[PDB]
Subunit: 177 residues, 4 copies
Amino acid sequence: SITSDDSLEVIARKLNREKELALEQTCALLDYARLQKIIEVISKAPFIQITGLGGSALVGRDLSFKLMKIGYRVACEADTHVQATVSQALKKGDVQIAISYSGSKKEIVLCAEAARKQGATVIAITSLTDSPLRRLAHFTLDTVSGETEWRSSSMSTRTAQNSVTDLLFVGLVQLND
Amino acid sequence: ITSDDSLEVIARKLNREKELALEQTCALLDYARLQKIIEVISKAPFIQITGLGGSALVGRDLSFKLMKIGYRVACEADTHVQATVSQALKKGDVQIAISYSGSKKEIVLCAEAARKQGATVIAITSLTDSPLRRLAHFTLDTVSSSMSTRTAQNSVTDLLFVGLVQLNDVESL
Amino acid sequence: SDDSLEVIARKLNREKELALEQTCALLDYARLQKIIEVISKAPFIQITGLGGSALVGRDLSFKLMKIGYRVACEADTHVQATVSQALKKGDVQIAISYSGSKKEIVLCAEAARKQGATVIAITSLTDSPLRRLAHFTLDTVSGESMSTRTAQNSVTDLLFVGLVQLNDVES
Amino acid sequence: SITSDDSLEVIARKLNREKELALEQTCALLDYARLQKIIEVISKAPFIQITGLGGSALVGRDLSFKLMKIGYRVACEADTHVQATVSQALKKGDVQIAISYSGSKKEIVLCAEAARKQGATVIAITSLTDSPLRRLAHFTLDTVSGETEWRSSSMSTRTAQNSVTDLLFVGLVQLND
């Protein structure tokens, strides 16, 4: 989509269109009945681990700061060795929120498998493709990217992921009643 | 946007608010100015990216992209690490300061220290006349809610990056 | 310090050794056992610190996480601060600070005690805000900066080993 | 079963003893002629990546902040994916300081391979064992443990590493003073 022929303005406009598409298609895929039960699940979580890698870990930590900001016990950890040990020590009733577009990055898949072995609940924020991460998840929130993989690789994907976490957070706060 | 709403109404409302941030931010772009900014970033021996709170995550997000392509970058959530790095900047280096307000003490002092050291300061900030906007060599404006703000900030950094790759690609060829 | 590198290496090692000796000599093993028991029963544990003593806290955090304790240890102060506001009766805060009077650590220990949690300080001997606010204090004595870290790690490493022994004893 | 001793006071004394011997034996193993050459090479590095995992990464972070404060351009990154992208982008004349006791941690080994591939100069802070990391290093700084039953524990290993990093920092302040 974005090519070496483009002016800076066309690039600017192309980028915004990719994010707008990523937001709309992600939104269109939402099962609002399934979104609600997920929020219910997160809300009763004694402990929440949020896993990710690279740019998507920033999305997870963005959400971890917001959940801590309202009294949730949240682990979100960049060091993959440390992230893995947290997963291997989760307990039944805990919640893992796995943010990974591909669903086939080993470290993230290994952490989700460890959560399941320990009996934690796994929520995957991931792309529509059938992936090891999707097959490990109790619930899945689908993210549709709009990007040119060779140019805008961690941009509309991250916008799609941010839209899901933002919604999760607002729906959680809305459970103030 | 209010409670009593359903989750679908919230999702749409949040999506529209981001959509407005993307479009009102791009609407103020000065493409001749932005090109000069990319050139400056492109030639920088060293780049510091300052921020705090969510703007720090936006800074790290961009620093990962610049680091992958071999640009020498510092961007650090610890408030006083980030201050030691600004003061240690030298002439010709570049600081990218991301704050919506422009009056946050730490971002202001890091930007002071960076022009004290003779670096170029690029500010990604709101249209509010601010101490940051005054200290900056260049400003890219962001119009935005803390979600919309991060959305607006990311649209500037993402554009700077793809523009940087585009220019660097033109030269290599 | 216009000494050789060899003189520097030995001098740094002797400061570290003195920090270990002087810190170990102040240990009260009766209170340490009580402290280990408090930590072991906490549903949630926050470890606070700033600068190098934050790294010390995270070093402990990694080991506690691996054996199943729920532990927050954030090196960003505003994150650390809001994690203190959410503490609950029965939780535990481990506050690591040599001075004992750094505003950010003092503010988190107040919140912890306010919120009903137990505060365990790892701090120098001086009469300090952190020491007055703690339910339990473990002393660290330097050997002079680098030896301060060494002193703090010797207390945390001991807490870690005590806790592992506590479970293998009741296994 | 973590310890063969029953008494906390015995444990505390043995643990401190292990640390005292890790410090002294690592110190005795220093080729102070090499160490000055090593400090000289770090002094000239336009860019310094410090690599590690888990506890060893905290040592590298502690060093990275001391070095940044006296003005050096330093990368030190907990996220193993990002860290790997930094190693892959090093250039000739850059220095990588790889901090791993074992020398056989996949991610540290692959970061040193990438650094050497691209022509960076690799200084390893590692144990004496013949390791993939030691065979890849241009320079080595040996971290060994004490005699006790606590050898090779992360507590002993962190202590030996810290003494080496503390020394490198002080030797650098001495030039740059």
